[PDB]
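Fold this complex.
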Amino acid sequence: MQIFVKTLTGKTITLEVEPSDTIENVKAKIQDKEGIPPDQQRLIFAGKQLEDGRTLSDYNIQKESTLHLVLRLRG
Amino acid sequence: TIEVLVTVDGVNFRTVVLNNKNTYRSQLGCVFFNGADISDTIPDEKQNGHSLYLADNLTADETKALKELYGPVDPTFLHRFYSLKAAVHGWKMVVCDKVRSLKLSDNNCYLNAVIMTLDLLKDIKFVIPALQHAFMKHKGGDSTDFIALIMAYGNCTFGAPDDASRLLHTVLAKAELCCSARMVWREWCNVCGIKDVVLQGLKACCYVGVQTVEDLRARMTYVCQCGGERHRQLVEHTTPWLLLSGTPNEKLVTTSTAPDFVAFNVFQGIETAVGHYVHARLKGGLILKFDSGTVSKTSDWKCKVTDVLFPGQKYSSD
Ligand SMILES: [Zn+2]
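Structure:
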């Protein structure tokens, strides 16, 4: 299926993913496109932070859904 | 030859005999005696009467008890937790201006933001026993276990700086409400139709992406499954408290007519390098800046806010 990832630049990229794909798996694809390491990625979906262990179907993320990429801070 | 005990929960033990020809790692595995990694030494005498703490190569019954106690965890969760628990023993919780806080050490200012924010969340508990155990323990004056646990779950490394919001929401994802709260979203698409979505529990109290209640109630716009424009708007919301979180945003916080929120966290420095976290609350008519062991009580602040906590909610879309 198709999902959207609002990047840090402000642009929107498009990923082809499966419901069984883990959040980490998505972050890996984002890495190859944006050049951002999975460690420093925070994916947000409708106000919920996506924990690494889960999958897209777990968070009820279907086609045309929009994930938000937030940079991991260092305090 | 010696004979020692082995546990992973501090309740169920098993008697194990190890030879003095091979180390713990090759005979038994990763173990912690008296809070120290002895998994590369040779069996001695003061441990030939007391107990150890296994981390890897568990039994079917220990793995069973692990899931009951720690929930589903990383294969390295046990090792990291033992290591962290020993490392954070030196940390201390002070009492800065009738509020407790984590004293600055080994880049733990982000952890101060998390804990001090957690302490302001009413009616919450944890599904995982060990977590809830360490939580109630924390409420009473010893917070060593709790700190080490949330660091273990958030994959925090000792001494390394980290994200406070990220850790806070990872923690809350393993928590639940000891009361009730509802959140009603009205989604609609000109083609597909109107659909109401209800959120109930702790999930109704947290939202990442906005920092003002007004923006939470504003009509949001995204893409429907058909490809067309889809909309969403909060039309009903009742919570004991509302936690809004977003990217560091520079707001002009002034106590002159103090805004709706009770507390907020602040990221100082530049977000591409290593910065600093400061927890802030609203007591009286002045701001209270809690800097991991300090209490600046000035009444004005131009800062980059991150997490913003609001009181109970009660809203209807007329
Ligand atoms: Zn539609």
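Chain A has one domain: 1-75.
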